Design an enzyme around this catalytic site. Structure first.
Site, PDB file in Angstrom:
ATOM      1  N   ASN A 164       7.063  -1.629   3.184  1.00 34.90           N
ATOM      2  CA  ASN A 164       7.625  -2.397   2.090  1.00 34.90           C
ATOM      3  C   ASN A 164       8.803  -1.608   1.581  1.00 34.90           C
ATOM      4  O   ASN A 164       8.627  -0.503   1.081  1.00 34.90           O
ATOM      5  CB  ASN A 164       6.613  -2.527   0.948  1.00 34.90           C
ATOM      6  CG  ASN A 164       5.752  -3.767   1.064  1.00 34.90           C
ATOM      7  OD1 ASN A 164       4.681  -3.733   1.659  1.00 34.90           O
ATOM      8  ND2 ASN A 164       6.210  -4.866   0.478  1.00 34.90           N
TER       9      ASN A 164
ATOM     10  N   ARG B 181       2.008  -5.080   3.902  1.00 31.15           N
ATOM     11  CA  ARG B 181       1.985  -4.081   4.974  1.00 31.15           C
ATOM     12  C   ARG B 181       0.693  -4.149   5.773  1.00 31.15           C
ATOM     13  O   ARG B 181       0.708  -4.242   6.997  1.00 31.15           O
ATOM     14  CB  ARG B 181       2.123  -2.664   4.404  1.00 31.15           C
ATOM     15  CG  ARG B 181       3.511  -2.271   3.943  1.00 31.15           C
ATOM     16  CD  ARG B 181       3.501  -0.828   3.449  1.00 31.15           C
ATOM     17  NE  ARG B 181       2.224  -0.539   2.813  1.00 31.15           N
ATOM     18  CZ  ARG B 181       1.541   0.589   2.961  1.00 31.15           C
ATOM     19  NH1 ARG B 181       2.020   1.576   3.706  1.00 31.15           N
ATOM     20  NH2 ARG B 181       0.373   0.730   2.352  1.00 31.15           N
TER      21      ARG B 181
END
Ligand SMILES: [Cl-]
Length: 95
Positions: A43, A25
């Site tokens: 995620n 991320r």
């Protein structure tokens, strides 16, 4: 169209593979910011990385190529993207 309207679009992406426990991320947000893109990344639990990225098309296409590599220790098996109806974002955030 305005210049920004003409020269920008948005895409939606899912990224599969070894994408957990590698700060995926954060790496997407950093890469996106470096490319002057806006949008978001998360995620998915037990699943893929998902993101929306908006901005100039050259930057978008550099991002989509980079997603096959990802951050160190990531092992990406697929990148699936499509252009989408434009959404307005002022920045790029993790979700
Ligand atoms: Cl953020």
């Amino acid at each position: 169209m305005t210049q920004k309207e003409k020269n920008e679009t948005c895409i939606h992406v899912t990224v599969s593979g070894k994408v957990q426990g590698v700060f995926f991320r954060e790496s997407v947000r950093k890469k996106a910011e470096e490319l002057q893109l806006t949008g978001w990344v998360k995620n998915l639990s037990h699943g893929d990385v998902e993101l929306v990225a908006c901005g100039e098309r050259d930057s978008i296409m550099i991002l989509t190529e980079w997603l096959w590599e990802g951050p160190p220790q990531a092992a990406v098996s697929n990148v699936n993207w499509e252009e989408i109806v434009v959404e307005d974002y002022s920045d790029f955030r993790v979700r």
